[PDB]
């Protein structure tokens, strides 16, 4: 269980610059990132084993994302992961992998965490981590955009867990994803 608060905050500022977020809301988003990560890492690793691979590559992350994410979320996320990997390889001057990939979330840490889920002699590809990092950032961004929107609609300045609730429960796919994810624990 890790901390993504700083990064989550950076994503919030890209989409709702003048909207704040409470510590209680941040705690829940941190749980969101961790829980989703675990579900995707767990599936990807299994997928590598069944396809007889010794490395969890972006192909597997993609397959997992498609099994775990509903409908439109899966396709947009796939678009995001793919785009990040492409950027990452296209632009090599930047010092940070997150920066090369155009991400706010931490690619390096996500690679490290991804390792714990790789059981055997199985390896984690750099691209697998970039793809995963992009997906988590994207999901987090969707929740934040919707929660920020709910706060604005209610004429308030800060995102609370109630706004997170309205955003998630009011969106069929996110609701489905979260309920399924909860069932997973």
């Amino acid at each position: 269980k890790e901390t993504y608060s700083s990064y989550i905050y950076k994503v919030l500022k890209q989409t709702h610059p003048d909207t704040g977020i409470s510590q209680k809301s941040m705690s829940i988003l941190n749980s969101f990132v961790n829980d989703i990560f675990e579900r995707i890492a767990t599936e990807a690793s299994k997928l590598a084993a069944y396809n007889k691979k010794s490395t969890i590559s972006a192909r597997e992350i993609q397959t997992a994302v498609r099994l775990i994410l509903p409908g439109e979320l899966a396709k947009h996320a796939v678009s995001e992961g793919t785009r990040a990997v492409t950027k990452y390889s296209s632009s090599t001057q930047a010092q940070s992998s997150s920066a090369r990939a155009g991400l706010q979330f931490p690619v390096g840490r996500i690679k490290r965490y991804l390792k714990r889920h790789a059981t055997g002699r199985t390896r984690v590809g750099s691209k697998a981590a970039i793809y995963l990092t992009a997906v988590l950032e994207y999901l987090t961004a969707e929740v934040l955009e919707l929660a920020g929107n709910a706060a604005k609609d209610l004429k308030v300045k800060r995102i609370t867990p109630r706004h997170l609730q309205l955003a998630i429960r009011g969106d069929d796919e996110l609701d489905s994803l979260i309920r399924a994810t909860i069932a997973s624990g």
């Binding site: 409470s22 510590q23 209680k24 809301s25 705690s27 867990p161 979260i178 309920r179 909860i182």
Partner: peptide
């Protein structure tokens, strides 16, 4: 901690703002 199940009186949030160092 507070997890996703919480979302299923959430407006009673008196927690302080999340902030990062300006320095």
């Amino acid at each position: 901690s507070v997890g996703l199940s919480a979302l299923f009186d959430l407006d009673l949030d008196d927690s302080e703002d999340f902030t990062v160092n300006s320095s």
